[PDB]
Design a protein around this ligand. Structure first.
Ligand SMILES: Nc1ncnc2c1ncn2[C@@H]1O[C@H](COP(=O)(O)OP(=O)(O)OP(=O)(O)O)[C@@H](O)[C@H]1O
Ligand SMILES: Nc1ncnc2c1ncn2[C@@H]1O[C@H](COP(=O)(O)OP(=O)(O)O)[C@@H](O)[C@H]1O
Ligand SMILES: Nc1ncnc2c1ncn2[C@@H]1O[C@H](COP(=O)(O)OP(=O)(O)O)[C@@H](O)[C@H]1O
Ligand SMILES: Nc1ncnc2c1ncn2[C@@H]1O[C@H](COP(=O)(O)OP(=O)(O)O)[C@@H](O)[C@H]1O
Ligand SMILES: [Mg+2]
Lengths: 80, 193, 1622
């Protein structure tokens, strides 16, 4: 289907644009007393989690577009 | 006879009122009919095979909803009520809605106050059109707020002017009007500093 | 001989115990002292049980048993008697006091007269023999009491109209329930029982005060002890009627309050205009008058002072006496603040707090007036403020006080409110007062909307109390319909009270529109009442409500509180919105609230503490990680402030006691000055917030506290006694206890936090992932509190989502308007009534289930400070102080902010319950509880000792679990699912050791062999429990990981995974292939339903299933359809002879009603002294409810399946609730096995983690090419023994079969069409078809066998195909496969394209020529036109093929058709023709417009009776258009899947059916008499004789929906795709 190949190309492009790595932040006794680190820890945590989830979903979508794996309910909803 | 649609007893009352009025030439109004679409289809089918009185009228007040039957829409005549297009139009609607006798009362300054209320209502309602800039959200500044403001102006002008024909502008209770419009009448719906 | 002494004591007590009898109005002798008798019976039963626990019990066993029985009977008798007696009492007071009741209800009066005669005769017999045993020995006393109870309940249920008219007599009775109103009317003579009903009728009157005679009412009292003495006492003797003297009491209360207010104002005028105030005189005046009157007098004095000062200032340039008013207010506030700094009585302390709040508001207002330089009394800066004017010269006392705001004037209602909590007068509260009074003046309702927790309902109530108005708060929901709201409005109009409707938008939009009319009518009535021309002496103002003219009291008002933009709720119509003046409440002034609350509680640094606590709450809101259960709004701040006041009081008490016990020196000023107020605030903040925080947020909170409150430290108090009690409870419950950092410290800390939250909040919620110790935490806390305090603890566990909301809260009948209670409502009402002393215990109502707004928002009023449960019929049930509402939930993703803010939160992270504690619990249970019900105990202890090294932190099991969490499984992995499965397998291993010892009585198993076996079986169980629900590759991965990490010996084989090895009882690994023989199937049993060819997967899964079933543990089999889940389960069950299985097939619309009907059919409920027990009717057997589609039922918008929650409730709590009478019913001898497709498959939902924690899941996958080849080669070898010459072709043919199947399973998938499911079921059908074709033949060449094989392949793999290209591919691939696997054969003689097989032209299933078949069908159609249907048909080849297929299907048992094609293609006509040719009787339901579920049920009953009782073959033809409801598809699903509908035949019909069934059996020659055998024979006959043809259009989304709404069509019905004509 044409839409399958368009989705494949779009997923590949999105994987190219979206970055790959994001390292977390370590806790320290004096870091906790600094609210700036209190905020940046949460920021990087949520960013890494969301980046991992988005990249995994897009990799699953492109892998389906290559036909390697089947379609699940969550995967069908995401593709839709 | 005004009946609110939504209850089974409401449907019974609507049927009885329509049956009485088609013979007695009485007006029947049914509100929020968009909540009973199948009953609207039945009502339209009943209305088609009917020979009502000459003066009989049946008003069906509803909101624009995709659930209303097409047959009912084609059978009746549709009037759309929405914010008036221009400030001139809004002020004309406000002045037409308010009775002439109410504006022309003992204080000669009541007409100026009613004109100020009309202009303020028009300005607020038209600022509502541009939601991001005019306000912070779509507030429901409608005819109820205007009626409440008019009642407040009437009450406080009568209280201040004990039947006197003329009142000095300095003696007008500006503070009362401003506070009640900012806190109670129009400022009630405002949830933003 | 202590047992003999106890028995003698019991005999002596029960030989000298007499029922205490007291004369009742010279009519009879009522039994008195129920509590003593009940306690005696309970303690004697407990003593008998303890005697049973004694080892010597045997010598007295018989005797003891007898006493137990007698005791039970006693309780049973007096479990009914009391209730009966109670009812009779008030019922008598209604059938004698009112002389008119005889005319209204003569039949009810006669029935009650007969019942009263019976009851009086029984009571006379009892008075003859007051001995308890003699009363017990009366013949038929129990049945007589039950009959009396039922009849009295019926009469009670038949008194609705009289109660409604009595409500019309006294308006306040509109707020009293039917039972309570009946009691009030009946017990008018004895007013001692009416004291508990005044809290529902009056705002603050908790009880009335009478003289010693109880004939004159001298005054009223509130719940805190405050009393009001009537100036002119109301005497009951002159006004015997209840409503008359109640009205007199109300009027006298109003008049007395008016006069007392006059006196208080006269006294307080001295305090005003005074430079100095004597604290003693001020305190005396405060103590002399009621709190509301004290506050009102202060307000009146301040208002008069300000009015006089402004009148003096009216000159403009004159001096300011407003400074004098401000100075006087400040002096009085200083006096009050000094007074509250020292100890005061609680009532005086609350009065002082109210006065401080009022005077702070007055000081702020006066300061604002001074700053604004106001000098005129008519300035709006003073007119906007609320003003009180008292006119002593007024003749009418009730109109002496007037309260004004702007242009709005009101008269004080003088309703006794007692001492109500008073809100601080924030600027937002002033805006609320102004807006609501403006709405009231214009006769419009008030609508304060905004987010939850902004003080809307409380502000409305505070305004209502400021005017002295009765304010009733209703928690509205969708159940509040037009009639209920009209009744409530009538009550409000007649009483003259304020109605605050919280959550008004939760009504239906249509219902809101309907209510708008009543609101409008009430508003017009009020507007006409307000007219000055109207005179009170004329006709009273009335409005039309519920077609009745009801008087409208001017004091009434309607307020609606709304939370727009939340889950649930609706949109108000514009015509309804125009009737209310709206007001936005979004940003309450938290700083001012905190400051004034701390100031009024005696804090010296109130300003500093408020400025430190409100920004602290903002910081907490903006800093801690976002959570669904987090709430830092104003409710949390208010709770913190109240806790701060309480903790300050406790610290003052502690300091005073320490000073008293250490010397003699007490100074209240010294204590107040030396007090760490900041430390108290930190303690309260920690105790209230810390439990709700996740592990990572706790350091953030503590750092934030240090930043905002430097230098203060929180040291949590060590509850020594509670910790010892927790130790004892955990020891006796096999739990692990830990103090501090030890194993179990986090859990014990959570339990202590839960206790501290219980001491503060009446509504709790334990939030945490499944397997975090919540349930055990609260159970252990309840037991520890029971032991420490000595008060009994009772817990009512309710699953809110396992039952409908109507069954949970109750329902109002649409026609007769009769209220029947729900589950929670019934429990709460039973606790409130306290018939059997429930108010003296600790009652904990635990809502163990999912939380969604629809059902939990009904508890909003309960969880607020109202503490009321509001019902649509006007009832309001007060929450008792001992009742706690607790929620045990795993998440709050769907709960609104309105709910999370109302409940205290305790967060149980998964880390509080470590794996080590679970291991210790398992080992303790193994070492303590024997498995049988001792050699068993010794075996268990030895096995536990052997397994101890592996069940340790950083051990084989822990590392195995950590690695298994990294694998992918068919379902989401949880810790406790694997742990429970492993524990079940280890228990089975102990049982295996026991059975080995039994089988070798002379040679019991030694320690070495036992240890070896336990090690091997532990590894086996770890592998099969941590990877049972995973694919083969991950099973091998886990096996190799264990091989790397373990130390036990393992099989030496180099490539065979450990999963292929079992553990012999000798303690050695043995391959599973040793139990996989090459059997030979009998020829007549080829591919039979009960024939199972043993393979590796089959034997392993049978062993695992036997292990899980032998422990009576619910389990789940997951896998693709056709894998063999049902086959494997039935094969495993065949090894268990005392277990009977019943199949329930779940669908998209499956509800717990299916399970309830199955229980009603196969089981029975029986009453025992411990409650109701539901057990199978056949004794000695275990019922296995096999659910085929456990994950199909619809998941609502809040992520919950009702049937799954029901199953979880019955699995975990071992029972459910009968909603017919709200009774806890315990399951006995019932087990749960389920089957399901993978959750990733379309239409399948993932099971909840709470449910999966109980059920181990085993993944049954498709047989591989090797397994399929083995099984169907065995089947083909068995099949081809009919024709010896074809035997040599058994080996290739199977391969060909397999090959084609494989390609199909790859070529067509569910991605193309929803019905493209190919499984070994098609292979079995293939083998069956070839066998049936070959059975009657004597000889056949290879070409004939190939032709039969090709025909079967076409019929199974081409009928369901949609596109023509797919059918062409199937044809070509069949040809290629047959040529490849069968060379050197005549291609044209075996694969001529018109492959038609039919037995119409012969006696056998032989190939038929198309032309001869066409001629025969033409002749049969010519006959058919004359016989049944005169509709001509045009015969083409597709028609011949279709009729051949339909005839093939009708010639099978349980052969159903799914004909899919465009309408008008001839599906129904062809079905009728083939049914006529086969002798089947065509049945079609004659659906019309009025067709309902009852009609379909009746038609189904008719068809089943004809097909099973009369042995008549029926072709049930049904179209998709005939499906008018989902119930039709549910019944069809059940009938297609099982051949029986469990709930179709009920009552008389069932009996009739049974009779017919009996006759049918007698006609067949079978000797059947039992009902179960008759029903089994009926089911078999229905299966053999009923064929259902379902015809539907080839829609895509329709087919996808049908694939999940009723899976039996795509699993039990053979799908034929006719389509449009080519
Ligand atoms: N203190 C403890 N020591 C040892 N084992 C414990 C302890 N507390 C709980 N357990 C065990 O751990 C498991 C947790 O069960 P529990 O009912 O407490 O969990 P839950 O969080 O309430 O579960 P759910 O949300 O599924 O209802 C049970 O097997 C229980 O016996
Ligand atoms: N002006 C106020 N002074 C003191 N407490 C207040 C005030 N406004 C609200 N509250 C507190 O709010 C809590 C209940 O809020 P509530 O009115 O039930 O929220 P909602 O407006 O969502 O119904 C009460 O404990 C009350 O003490
Ligand atoms: N070892 C085996 N021996 C014989 N038949 C088997 C074997 N394994 C699978 N089958 C076939 O697979 C089919 C399984 O169907 P069923 O158990 O109803 O699937 P499910 O339970 O998943 O709905 C049966 O028809 C059976 O003939
Ligand atoms: N092969 C055929 N030759 C002639 N008429 C036909 C044929 N098939 C269907 N019909 C017509 O279709 C009508 C019946 O339609 P029916 O089979 O009930 O629709 P459906 O196939 O949707 O069940 C008959 O009146 C008949 O005239
Ligand atoms: Mg639990």
């Amino acid at each position: 289907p044409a839409w399958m190949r368009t989705l494949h190309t779009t997923a590949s492009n999105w994987l190219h644009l979206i970055p790959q790595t994001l390292s977390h932040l370590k806790r320290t006794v004096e870091n906790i007393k600094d609210p700036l680190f209190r905020f940046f820890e949460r920021e990087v945590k949520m960013g890494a989690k969301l980046l991992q989830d988005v990249r995994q979903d897009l990799a699953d979508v492109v892998q389906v577009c290559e036909g390697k794996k089947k379609q699940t309910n969550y995967l069908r909803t995401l593709i839709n | 006879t005004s009946i609110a649609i939504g209850s089974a007893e409401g449907f019974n009352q609507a049927d009885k009122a329509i049956n009485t009025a088609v013979k007695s030439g009485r007006w029947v109004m049914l509100k929020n009919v968009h909540l009973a679409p199948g009953w609207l289809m039945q009502l339209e089918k009943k209305l088609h095979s009917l020979q009502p009185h000459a003066c009989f009228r049946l008003f069906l007040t509803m909101e624009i909803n995709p659930k209303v039957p097409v047959n009912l829409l084609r059978a009746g005549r549709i009037f759309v009520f929405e914010p008036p297009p221009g400030v001139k139009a809004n002020m004309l609607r406000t002045f037409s809605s308010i009775p002439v006798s109410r504006i022309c009362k003992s204080p000669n300054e009541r007409a100026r106050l009613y004109f100020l209320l009309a202009w303020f209502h028009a300005i607020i309602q038209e600022r509502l059109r541009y939601a991001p800039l005019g306000w912070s959200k779509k507030y429901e500044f409608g005819e109820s707020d205007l009626r409440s403001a008019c009642d407040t102006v009437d009450t406080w002008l009568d209280d201040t002017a004990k039947g006197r024909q003329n009142i000095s502008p300095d003696k007008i209770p500006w503070s009362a009007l401003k506070t009640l419009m900012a806190q109670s009448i129009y400022g009630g719906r405002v949830d933003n500093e | 001989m202590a047992l003999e002494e106890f028995l003698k004591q019991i005999r002596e007590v029960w030989n000298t115990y007499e029922l205490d009898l007291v004369n009742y109005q010279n009519k009879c002798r009522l039994i008195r002292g129920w509590d003593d008798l009940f306690n005696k019976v309970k303690e004697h039963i407990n003593s008998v049980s303890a005697m049973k626990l004694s080892p010597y019990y045997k010598v007295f066993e018989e005797d003891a048993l007898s006493w137990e029985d007698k005791l039970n009977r006693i309780m049973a008798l007096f479990d009914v008697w009391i209730d009966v007696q109670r009812r009779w009492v008030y019922l008598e007071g209604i059938f004698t006091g009112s002389a008119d009741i005889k005319h209204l209800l003569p039949v009810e009066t006669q029935r009650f007269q007969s019942i009263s005669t019976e009851f009086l005769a029984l009571m006379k017999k009892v008075s003859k023999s007051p001995l308890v045993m003699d009363v017990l020995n009366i013949q038929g006393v129990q049945r007589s009491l039950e009959r009396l109870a039922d009849l009295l309940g019926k009469i009670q249920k038949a008194l609705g109209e009289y109660l409604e008219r009595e409500r019309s007599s006294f308006p306040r009775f509109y707020f009293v329930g039917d039972e309570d109103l009946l009691e009030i009317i009946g017990n008018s003579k004895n007013v001692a029982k009416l004291q508990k009903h005044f809290k529902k009728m009056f705002a603050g009157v908790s009880s009335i005060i009478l003289n010693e005679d109880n004939s004159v009412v001298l005054g009223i009292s509130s719940r805190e002890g405050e009393e009001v003495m009537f100036k002119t006492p109301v005497s009951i003797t002159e006004h015997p009627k209840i409503n008359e003297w109640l009205t007199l009491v109300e009027k006298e209360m109003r008049v007395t309050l008016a006069k007392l207010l006059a006196e208080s104002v006269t006294e307080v005028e001295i305090f005003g205009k005074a430079t100095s105030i004597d604290p003693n005189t001020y305190i005396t005046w405060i103590d002399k008058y009621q709190a509301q009157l004290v506050v009102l007098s202060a307000q009146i004095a301040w208002s008069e002072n300000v009015e006089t000062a402004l009148s003096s200032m009216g000159g403009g340039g004159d001096a300011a006496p407003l400074h004098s008013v401000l100075s006087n207010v400040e002096v009085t506030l200083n006096v009050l603040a000094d007074s509250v700094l020292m100890e005061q009585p609680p009532l005086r302390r609350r009065k002082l707090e109210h006065l401080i709040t009022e005077l702070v508001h007055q000081r702020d207002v006066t300061r604002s007036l001074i700053k604004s330089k106001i000098d005129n009394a008519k300035s709006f800066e003073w007119l906007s403020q609320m003003r009180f004017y008292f006119d002593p010269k007024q003749t009418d006392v009730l109109q002496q006080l007037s309260i004004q705001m702007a242009n709005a004037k009101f008269n004080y209602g003088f309703e006794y409110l007692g001492v109500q909590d008073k809100l601080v007068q924030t600027p937002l509260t002033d805006r609320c007062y102004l807006t609501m009074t403006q709405a009231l003046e214009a006769r419009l309702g008030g609508s304060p909307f905004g987010p939850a927790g902004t003080g809307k309902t409380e502000s409305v109530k505070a305004l209502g109390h400021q005017l002295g108005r009765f304010v009733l708060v209703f928690n509205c929901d969708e159940t509040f319909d037009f009639q209920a709201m009209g009744r409530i409005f009538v009550g409000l109009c007649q009483v003259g009270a304020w109605g605050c409707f919280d959550e008004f938008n939760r009504l239906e939009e249509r219902m809101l529109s309907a209510v708008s009319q009543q609101v409008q009518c009430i508003q017009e009535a009020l507007r006409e009442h307000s007219n000055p021309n109207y005179d009170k002496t004329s006709a009273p103002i009335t409005c039309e409500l519920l077609n009745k003219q009801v008087k409208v009291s001017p004091d009434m008002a309607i307020f609606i509180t709304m939370n727009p933009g939340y889950a649930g709720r609706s949109n108000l119509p514009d015509n309804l919105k125009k009737l209310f003046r709206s007001l936005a409440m979004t940003k309450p002034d938290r700083q001012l609230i905190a400051q004034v609350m701390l100031y009024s509680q005696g804090f010296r640094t109130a300003e500093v503490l408020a400025n430190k606590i409100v920004p602290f709450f903002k910081l907490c809101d903006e800093q801690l990680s976002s959570q669904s259960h987090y709430d830092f709004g104003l409710r949390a701040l208010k709770s913190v402030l109240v806790s701060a006041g309480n903790v300050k009081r406790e610290r003052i008490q502690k300091i005073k006691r320490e000073k008293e016990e250490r010397g003699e020196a007490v100074d209240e000023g010294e204590i107040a000055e030396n007090l760490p107020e900041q430390e108290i605030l930190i303690q309260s903040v920690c105790e209230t917030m810390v439990p709700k925080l996740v592990a990572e947020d706790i350091p953030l909170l503590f750092s934030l506290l240090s930043d905002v409150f430097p230098g203060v430290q929180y040291h949590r108090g060590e509850m020594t006694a509670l910790r010892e009690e927790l130790k004892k409870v955990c020891q006796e419950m096999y739990l692990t206890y830990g103090d501090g950092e030890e194993v179990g410290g986090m859990w014990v800390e959570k339990v202590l936090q839960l206790y501290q939250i219980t001491q503060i909040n009446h509504g709790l919620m334990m939030v945490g992932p499944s397997g975090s110790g919540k349930s055990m935490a609260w159970r252990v806390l309840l037991k520890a509190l029971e032991r420490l305090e000595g008060v009994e603890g009772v817990a009512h566990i309710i699953d809110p989502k396992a039952i409908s909301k109507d069954h949970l809260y109750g329902t109002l009948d649409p026609n007769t308007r009769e209220w029947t209670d729900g589950l929670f409502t019934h429990v709460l009402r039973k606790i409130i009534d306290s018939v059997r002393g429930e108010l003296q215990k600790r009652q904990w109502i635990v809502f163990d289930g999912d939380v969604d707004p629809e059902w939990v928002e009904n508890l909003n009023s309960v969880l607020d400070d109202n503490k009321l449960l509001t019902l649509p019929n006007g009832e309001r049930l007060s929450l008792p102080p001992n009742v706690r509402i607790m929620f045990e939930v795993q998440d709050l993703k769907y709960a609104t902010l309105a709910t999370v803010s109302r409940c205290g939160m305790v967060w149980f992270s998964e880390d509080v319950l470590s794996t080590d504690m679970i291991f210790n619990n398992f080992l303790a249970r193994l070492r303590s509880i024997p498995l049988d019900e001792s050699p068993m105990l010794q075996i268990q202890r030895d096995a536990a000792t052997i397994m101890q090294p592996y069940f340790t932190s950083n051990g084989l099991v822990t590392k195995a679990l950590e690695h298994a969490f990294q694998l992918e499984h068919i379902m989401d992995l949880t810790r406790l699912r694997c742990l429970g499965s492993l524990f079940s397998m280890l228990h089975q291993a102990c049982r295996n050791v026991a059975q080995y010892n039994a089988n070798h009585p002379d040679f019991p198993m030694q320690i070495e062999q036992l240890e070896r076996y336990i090690q091997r079986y532990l590894v086996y169980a770890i592998l099969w429990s941590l990877s049972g629900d995973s694919r083969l590759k991950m099973r091998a991965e886990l096996g190799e990981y264990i091989r790397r990490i373990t130390t036990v010996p393992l099989p030496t084989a180099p490539n065979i995974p450990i999963i292929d090895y079992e553990v012999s009882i000798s303690g050695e690994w043995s391959p599973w292939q040793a139990k996989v023989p090459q059997i030979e199937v009998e020829t007549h049993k080829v591919a039979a339903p009960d024939v199972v060819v043993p393979t590796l997967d089959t034997v392993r899964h049978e062993a695992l299933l036997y292990t899980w079933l032998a422990e009576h543990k619910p389990l789940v089999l997951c896998g693709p359809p056709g894998s063999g889940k049902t086959m494997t389960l039935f094969s495993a069950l065949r090894a268990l002879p005392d277990m009977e299985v019943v199949g329930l097939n779940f669908s998209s619309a499956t509800t717990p009603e299916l399970l309830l009907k199955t229980f009603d059919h196969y089981c029975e409920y029986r009453r025992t002294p411990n409650g109701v027990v539901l057990a199978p009717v056949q004794l000695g057997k275990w019922l296995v409810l096999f659910c085929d589609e456990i994950n199909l039922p619809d998941m609502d918008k809040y992520g919950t399946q009702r049937v799954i929650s029901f199953i979880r409730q019955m699995v975990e709590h071992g029972g459910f609730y009968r909603t017919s009478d709200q009774t806890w019913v315990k399951l006995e001898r019932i087990q749960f096995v389920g089957a399901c497709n993978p959750p990733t498959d379309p239409g399948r939902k993932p099971l909840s983690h709470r449910f999966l924690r109980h059920v181990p899941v085993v993944y049954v996958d498709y047989p591989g090419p090797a397994s399929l080849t083995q099984i169907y080669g065995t089947f083909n070898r068995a099949m081809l023994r009919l024709i010896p010459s074809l035997r040599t072709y058994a080996e290739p043919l199977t391969a060909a079969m397999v090959e084609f199947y494989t390609m199909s399973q790859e070529r067509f998938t569910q991605d193309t069409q929803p019905h493209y499911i190919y499984s070994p079921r098609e292979m079995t059908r293939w083998v069956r078809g070839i066998f049936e074709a070959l059975r009657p033949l004597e000889t056949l060449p290879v070409e004939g066998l190939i032709r039969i094989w090709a025909h079967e392949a076409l019929r199974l793999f081409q009928d369901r195909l949609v596109e023509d290209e797919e059918r062409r591919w199937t044809d070509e691939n069949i040809d290629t496969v047959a040529l490849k696997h069968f060379p050197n054969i005549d291609r044209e003689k075996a694969m001529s394209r018109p492959i038609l097989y039919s037995n119409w032209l012969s006696k056998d299933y032989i190939p038929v020529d198309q032309e001869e078949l066409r001629d025969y069908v033409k002749a049969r159609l010519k006959v058919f036109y004359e016989e049944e249907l005169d509709v001509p048909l045009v015969l083409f080849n597709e028609v011949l093929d279709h009729v051949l297929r339909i005839d093939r299907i009708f010639r099978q048992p349980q052969g159903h058709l799914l004909l899919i094609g465009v309408s008008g293609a001839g599906k129904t006509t062809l079905s009728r023709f083939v049914a006529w040719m086969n002798g089947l009787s065509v049945y079609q339901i004659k659906v019309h417009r009025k067709y309902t579920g009852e009609d379909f049920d009746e038609d189904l009953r008719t068809v089943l009776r004809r097909s099973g009782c009369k042995n008549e073959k029926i072709a049930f033809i049904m179209d998709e258009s005939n499906v008018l409801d989902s119930g039709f598809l549910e019944r069809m699903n059940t009938l297609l899947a099982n051949g029986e509908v469990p709930g179709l035949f009920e009552g008389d019909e069932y009996a009739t059916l049974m009779t017919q069934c009996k006759e049918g059996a007698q006609k067949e020659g079978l000797m059947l008499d039992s009902h179960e055998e008759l029903y089994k024979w009926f089911t078999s006959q229905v299966i053999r004789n009923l064929h259902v043809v379902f015809t539907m259009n080839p829609s895509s989304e329709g087919l996808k929906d049908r694939a999940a709404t009723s899976p039996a069509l795509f699993n039990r019905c053979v799908l034929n795709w006719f389509g449009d004509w080519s």
